[PDB]
Amino acid sequence: NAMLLGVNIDHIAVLRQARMVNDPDLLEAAFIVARHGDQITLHVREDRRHAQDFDLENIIKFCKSPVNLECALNDEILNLALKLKPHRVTLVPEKREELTTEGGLCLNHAKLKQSIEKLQNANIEVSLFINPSLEDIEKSKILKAQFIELHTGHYANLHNALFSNISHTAFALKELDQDKKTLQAQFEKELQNLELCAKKGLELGLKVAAGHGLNYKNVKPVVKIKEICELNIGQSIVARSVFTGLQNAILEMKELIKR
Amino acid sequence: NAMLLGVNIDHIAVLRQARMVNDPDLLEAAFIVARHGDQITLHVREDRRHAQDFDLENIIKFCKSPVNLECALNDEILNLALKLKPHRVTLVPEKREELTTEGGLCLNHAKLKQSIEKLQNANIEVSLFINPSLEDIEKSKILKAQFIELHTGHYANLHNALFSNISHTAFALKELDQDKKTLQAQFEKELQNLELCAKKGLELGLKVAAGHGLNYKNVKPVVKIKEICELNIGQSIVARSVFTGLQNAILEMKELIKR
Numbered sequence: 001n002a003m004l005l006g007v008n009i010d011h012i013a014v015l016r017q018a019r020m021v022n023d024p025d026l027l028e029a030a031f032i033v034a035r036h037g038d039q040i041t042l043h044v045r046e047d048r049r050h051a052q053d054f055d056l057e058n059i060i061k062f063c064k065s066p067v068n069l070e071c072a073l074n075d076e077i078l079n080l081a082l083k084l085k086p087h088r089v090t091l092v093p094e095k096r097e098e099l100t101t102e103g104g105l106c107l108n109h110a111k112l113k114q115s116i117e118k119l120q121n122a123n124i125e126v127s128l129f130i131n132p133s134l135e136d137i138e139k140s141k142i143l144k145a146q147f148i149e150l151h152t153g154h155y156a157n158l159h160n161a162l163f164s165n166i167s168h169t170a171f172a173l174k175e176l177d178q179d180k181k182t183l184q185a186q187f188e189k190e191l192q193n194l195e196l197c198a199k200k201g202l203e204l205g206l207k208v209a210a211g212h213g214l215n216y217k218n219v220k221p222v223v224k225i226k227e228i229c230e231l232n233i234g235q236s237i238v239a240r241s242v243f244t245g246l247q248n249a250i251l252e253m254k255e256l257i258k259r
Numbered sequence: 260n261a262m263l264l265g266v267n268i269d270h271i272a273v274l275r276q277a278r279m280v281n282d283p284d285l286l287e288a289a290f291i292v293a294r295h296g297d298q299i300t301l302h303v304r305e306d307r308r309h310a311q312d313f314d315l316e317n318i319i320k321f322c323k324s325p326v327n328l329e330c331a332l333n334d335e336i337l338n339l340a341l342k343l344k345p346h347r348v349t350l351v352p353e354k355r356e357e358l359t360t361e362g363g364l365c366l367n368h369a370k371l372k373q374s375i376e377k378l379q380n381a382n383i384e385v386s387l388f389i390n391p392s393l394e395d396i397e398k399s400k401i402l403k404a405q406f407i408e409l410h411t412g413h414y415a416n417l418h419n420a421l422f423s424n425i426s427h428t429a430f431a432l433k434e435l436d437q438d439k440k441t442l443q444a445q446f447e448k449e450l451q452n453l454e455l456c457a458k459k460g461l462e463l464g465l466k467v468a469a470g471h472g473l474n475y476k477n478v479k480p481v482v483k484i485k486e487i488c489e490l491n492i493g494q495s496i497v498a499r500s501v502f503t504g505l506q507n508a509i510l511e512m513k514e515l516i517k518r
């Protein structure tokens with residue numbers, strides 16, 4: 001079961017929007033992802049912080065790759081999805097009403113069920129970005145999602161605190177200022193839980209993806225979870241690309257997820 | 260007269276601050292600049308938008324390269340310069356009181372003369388980032404600057420409008436929505452003026468640098484201005500690095516500025 005790699009190009013658009021001179025060119029970057037990744041992912045936020053409507057249009061029109069649009073439950077972006085028809089839509093929280101404390105989508109949101117229906121009626125694959133809880137997995141099955149994407153964010157931060165220098169830097173997370181034994185127990189639980197949730201997802205006929213915070217060090221134990229078929233990774237790849245170029249950054253990640 | 264290249268690493272720090280996970284690592288990037296550039300430039304803004312105090316400290320402590328700190332006329336950053344002693348300080352506007360309409364430093368600012376004195380008293384080289392006007396060049400000589408850095412920002416935007424696709428994109432500048440002939444006349448004047456100002460600077464014993472907006476296409480006519488000894492370039496290099504890696508991005512630029 002070869003793992004698939006979705007490359008989220010949001011942070012290339014972050015750089016672009018930082019100077020407003022169309023450099024880096026997101027479509028150039030998308031051509032490289034189309035060739036060396038398995039899908040192109042982007043999040044067109046309601047506030048248009050990074051990726052834009054025209055980016056989604058351009059990528060759909062020009063790139064030889066499946067497209068995964070991440071978006072929230074606002075009508076404007078949903079309608080855009082319905083108009084342009086990316087291959088897949090991954091529903092993610094942006095507003096408070098969509099959020100949970102842990103960062104996955106609130107699966108009780110009033111608009112969620114109809115949103116899913118609208119998308120599937122338009123023949124768009126639907127993925128729900130969720131906390132790794134057995135309850136959220138079972139609800140996702142009930143809501144008729146084809147995919148779920150497990151939030152690896154807490155796992156990633158734990159891995160970083162334990163096996164890198166991040167706690168000695170200005171980027172240290174105050175919440176992870178606890179003794180190593182407690183951190184190590186939480187890390188093991190979090191990884192165990194990701195595996196349990198993937199198995200549950202697979203048992204219910206869902207396709208299981210994982211994403212948020214994955215990097216070239218913390219990805220390695222996630223690859224060993226046989227039941228995860230796809231990782232969606234952005235920020236760490238774009239951060240590596242500053243040193244190696246995007247092609248090599250993607251190819252390096254592909255080598256790590258071989259199994 | 261081989262042209263020197265200062266690499267401004269601000270936009271690598273922009274990426275880092277976008278996710279707050281110490282990736283990309285600015286010190287890693289600074290090691291690459293130290294090796295392949297001629298100086299490392301960074302702007303520690305009062306608002307700490309990108310580069311941080313600890314970045315200046317780390318680079319000064321660890322990197323085998325001259326350091327050029329860009330900063331404004333606030334006491335906090337000046338004191339930091341005085342404490343850490345980069346090789347050079349380039350005084351740039353951040354607040355309204357420091358600004359001119361065109362983007363160079365206001366050379367009448369009340370604190371400017373004393374700021375220059377404080378820095379030179381500490382044996383820090385001082386550069387003034389200025390509009391390309393003969394008047395600002397003569398004042399910079401009077402203020403006893405060792406360097407001036409000509410603002411190539413208007414030149415760059417003109418070049419982009421004329422010789423790239425930028426006017427057909429969402430990044431088009433409304434002010435440059437004018438007919439090609441007027442743009443072409445303004446472009447020629449702007450380039451002529453940059454040359455005139457460099458010659459004037461050199462005539463007065465100033466060292467002449469140039470920066471803002473320079474990229475792999477618009478740099479080429481600037482290299483032909485014999486009297487400019489140094490270019491300071493950031494955003495275009497970091498934008499290229501996403502595709503080629505920072506080493507190759509720097510080396511590519513170095514090849515273009517050979518003369």
Ligand code: PXP
Nearest residue numbers: 008129211212213232233234235
């Ligand atoms: C649902 C989802 N998956 C994966 C990613 C990629 O995450 P990262 O940039 O941390 O790798 C994102 C972007 O935050 C996302 O929203």
Ligand code: PXP
Nearest residue numbers: 267388470471472491492493494
């Ligand atoms: C004085 C000065 N020179 C050069 C640069 C580099 O400019 P750019 O990032 O547009 O190449 C900057 C950063 O805006 C600067 O402040």
